[PDB]
Design a protein around this ligand. Structure first.
Ligand SMILES: O=C1N[C@@H](Cc2cnc[nH]2)C(=O)N2CCC[C@@H]12
Length: 327
């Protein structure tokens, strides 16, 4: 089903200046399309989705078309208008039910967790293997429930910001390390995670060194933490286990303007990072990969976004599709 080297692209269910691309006009170089976004209302628990073009039937059909071409179409939950809060079981239930309705209604292949707010580790919540914060406990439970409700082909991805994942290396509490219990809690269902390596400023690698976003060293350092695992919150006895390599992707801006706070990296520089991550071929960078000979099963790249890419002469899709095809 899913290839071993993927390009995952976010698809704007909205016009933000980059315009709208009809599903059928989406470049075939994308393996997975993350429809953005499923959003919530006042109750911040019931997820709603209405296609930005066409009737419900038309959209269902365009999705079926893409799926007929072997593409996966996933519903991304989050964005600025998709805040989800699950303070109790009642909220979790509305969330689960609303999500399942949408998947059934439009035939989505799975869901993408792209929540960038409302997610905190409460005081006393110190064990990523056993979270105690309701939001996090309930989110894990809801995700497991939804996953189990569908067949073997159900796709589950996540796109947390670095603070929620790699940030766990520096601290564990509040947002810092907050997705770790989520990842750990659903790792048996997780298809892949593509952390947002952008709008992130700088990040500390397992070597305790600070790296700037948008540089090859940074990409390697941040990905290596998931590929190898790392000690959490300065505790050598609290190791977050490595994910499967085929569960690890990197999320990148398709163009400089797709990440106004920085993070874009040129394909030429990104290919150096990829060659190192995947093949264990260094490029004279400062960061030293945990695995000398690389992680060949590294899963691929995610991008914000399909719409930005199209507006940028398809630089992202063309460059990386060719690169991965060349493997
Ligand atoms: O780069 C991004 N940009 C924002 C832009 C937006 C918000 N709501 C609608 N569009 C976003 O949603 N993201 C989610 C994935 C990356 C991150």
């Amino acid at each position: 089903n899913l290839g071993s080297k993927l390009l995952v692209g976010y698809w704007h269910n909205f016009d933000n200046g980059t315009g709208i691309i009809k599903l059928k006009d989406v470049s075939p170089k994308w393996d997975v399309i993350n429809v953005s976004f499923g959003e919530t209302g006042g109750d911040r628990s019931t997820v709603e989705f209405s296609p930005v073009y066409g009737t419900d039937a038309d959209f269902k059909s365009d999705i079926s078309y893409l799926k007929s071409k072997g593409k996966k179409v996933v519903l991304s939950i989050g964005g600025q208008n998709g805040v989800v809060l699950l303070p109790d079981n009642a909220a979790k239930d509305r969330f689960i039910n609303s999500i399942q309705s949408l998947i059934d209604k439009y035939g989505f292949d799975g869901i993408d967790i792209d929540l960038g707010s409302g997610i905190y580790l409460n005081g006393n919540d110190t064990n990523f293997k056993n979270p105690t914060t309701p939001q996090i406990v309930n989110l894990i439970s809801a995700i497991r429930t939804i996953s189990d409700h569908y067949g073997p082909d159900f796709l589950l991805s996540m796109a947390p910001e670095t603070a929620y994942v790699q940030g766990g290396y520096s601290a564990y509490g509040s947002i810092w390390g907050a997705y770790l219990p989520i990842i750990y809690g659903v790792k048996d269902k997780l298809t892949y995670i593509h952390v947002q390596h952008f709008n992130a400023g700088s990040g500390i690698g397992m070597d305790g060194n600070n790296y700037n976003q948008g540089t090859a060293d940074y990409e390697v350092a941040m990905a290596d933490m998931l590929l190898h695992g790392f000690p959490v919150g300065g505790n050598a006895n609290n190791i977050f286990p490595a994910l499967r390599s085929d569960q690890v992707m990197i999320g990148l801006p398709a163009a400089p303007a797709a990440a106004p706070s920085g993070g874009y990296i040129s394909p030429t520089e990104m290919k150096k990072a990829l060659n190192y991550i995947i093949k264990g071929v260094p490029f004279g960078g400062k960061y030293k990969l945990s695995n000398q000979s690389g992680y060949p099963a590294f899963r691929g790249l995610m991008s914000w976004s399909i719409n930005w890419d199209a507006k940028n002469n398809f630089e992202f899709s063309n460059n990386y599709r060719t690169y991965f095809d060349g493997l």
